[PDB]
Amino acid sequence: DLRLHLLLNTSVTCNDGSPAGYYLKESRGSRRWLLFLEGGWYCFNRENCDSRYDTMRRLMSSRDWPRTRTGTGILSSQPEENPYWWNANMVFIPYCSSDVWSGASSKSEKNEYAFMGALIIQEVVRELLGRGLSGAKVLLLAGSSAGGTGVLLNVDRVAEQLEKLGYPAIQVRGLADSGWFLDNKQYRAPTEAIRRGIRYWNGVVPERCRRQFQEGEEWNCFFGYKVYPTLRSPVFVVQWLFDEAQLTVDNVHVQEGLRLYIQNLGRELRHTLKDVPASFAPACLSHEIIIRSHWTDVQVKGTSLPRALHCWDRSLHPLKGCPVHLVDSCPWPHCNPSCPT
């Protein structure tokens, strides 16, 4: 199991002012570190954050967190469950900031809630350097859903943090799972909700992307195909072609009109990944995968996701029989027989 540590700097807080934290299982024979960002949507004004505090409070507060968590999927220490990185040092960072890991605002006389996701990541990294991270060869920042978008927003800032602190030898990389969305036309909106969120959170985006889109337009950097070309750290993108959260925001729940909509969505997502050299994108209706225990089951062109990630590792030392770019071409959900049931 992974053991809970609340942050020693208690000014870095969850939404309600309680300390943020992380779950850790050390592997003293390994110089690889996996830091995973939890997901779970977000809230963008006082009224909908109040609702979330009533019935999704573990995503806003550490008051009720358990002392341990079992590592699953890519966070498992068993080679049978995790062929990729079973011997790595494992970290799970709970999502308690409701800001897609972008915020830098404290609770105050003028703010009912604190939104400190970007600062939580920074503080976890700093405290881990005293526990063994200082000796690392590779730090893989991973995440699912809102945490997958969080990887895209934060991987280059972690790389800059470690450089400025005097650790140029640690290679920082990103793994974004189910966080690559389209700002597309709905079947019957994310952009306006994210625009309001950034102002409510004092949200921050990567510097090069901010400089392209400029003031008032930072919401663009929450969309994978717009922020990814601005990033310097290596990033592997995992994305279902028919993501259930994408379909929810598109108001989709089969006649000709809906058939054409769904096929066009799959084609648009394929297009945005054409020039992403490390990626895994199966033609399935699902959401998240990398901390699911049966993440080993799905394959594209005969290659599993743990295998693709291992091939990525080798590429960062094309490879015969070890591909890193894997995108399905068939045009309908479950045209891949290995899709989750």
Ligand X SMILES: Cc1ccc(CN(C)Cc2ccccc2)o1
Ligand Y SMILES: *[C@@H]1O[C@H](CO)[C@@H](O)[C@H](O)[C@H]1NC(C)=O
Binding site for ligand Y (CB under 6 A): 9, 11-12, 119
Size of the site for ligand X (CB under 6 A): 14
Comparing every residue's Cβ against ligand Y, the nearest one is 9
Site for ligand X in 312-331 (CB under 6 A): none
List 39, 103, 174, 333, residue binding ligand X (CB under 6 A): 39
Comparison of 13 and 230: residue with beta carbon closer to ligand Y = 13
Active site (annotated) includes residue 294: no
Token look-up 């189910």 returns 178
Site for ligand X in 69-108 (CB under 6 A): 100
Is there binding between residue 249 and ligand X (CB under 6 A)? yes
List 19, 21, 71, 190, residue binding ligand X (CB under 6 A): 190
Comparison of 127 and 218: residue with beta carbon closer to ligand X = 218
Work out what residue 84 binds among ligand Y, ligand X, none; the CB cut-off runs from 5 to 8 Å by kind. none
- Contact indicator for 155, 228 with CB cutoff of 8 Å: no
Comparison of 97 and 144: residue with beta carbon closer to ligand Y = 97
- Contact indicator for 306, 324 with CB cutoff of 8 Å: no
Comparison of 181 and 312: residue with beta carbon closer to ligand X = 181
CB of 14 to ligand Y, least distance (A): 14
Active site (annotated) includes residue 334: no
Concatenating the DSSP letter of every residue in 263-291 gives: HHHHHHHHHHTTT-SSEEE-S-EE---TT
CB of 35 to ligand X, least distance (A): 18
Comparison of 24 and 49: residue with beta carbon closer to ligand X = 49
Comparison of 58 and 126: residue with beta carbon closer to ligand X = 58
Concatenating the DSSP letter of every residue in 62-119 gives: STT--SEE---GGG---TTT-TTTTTSEEEEE---SSSTT---B---SS-SS-B-HHH
Site for ligand X in 149-188 (CB under 6 A): 149, 179, 181
Give the angle subtended at the CA of 147 by the CAs of 195 and 123, to the nearest 5°.
95
Token look-up 């939104």 returns 115
Work out what residue 197 binds among ligand Y, ligand X, none; the CB cut-off runs from 5 to 8 Å by kind. none
Concatenating the DSSP letter of every residue in 178-237 gives: S-----PPP---HHHHHHHHHHHHT----HHHHHHH-TT-GGGGGSHHHHGGG--S-EEE
Site for ligand X in 203-232 (CB under 6 A): 222
CB of 333 to ligand Y, least distance (A): 43
Q: What is the largest CA-CA distance in the chain?
A: 60
Token look-up 């800059």 returns 160
Is there binding between residue 245 and ligand X (CB under 6 A)? yes
CB of 129 to ligand X, least distance (A): 29
- 45's tokens: 């004004």
Give the angle subtended at the CA of 21 by the CAs of 66 and 86, to the nearest 5°.
80
Catalytic residue among 62, 287, 304, 325: 287
Catalytic residue among 145, 178, 279, 304: 145
- Contact indicator for 74, 13 with CB cutoff of 8 Å: no
- Contact indicator for 101, 154 with CB cutoff of 8 Å: yes
Active site (annotated) includes residue 243: yes
Dist CA 181 CA 195 (whole Å): 15
User: Which residues are the active-site residues?
Assistant: 145, 243, 287
Which residues form the interface with ligand X (CB under 6 A)? 39-41, 100, 145-146, 149, 179, 181, 190, 194, 222, 245, 249
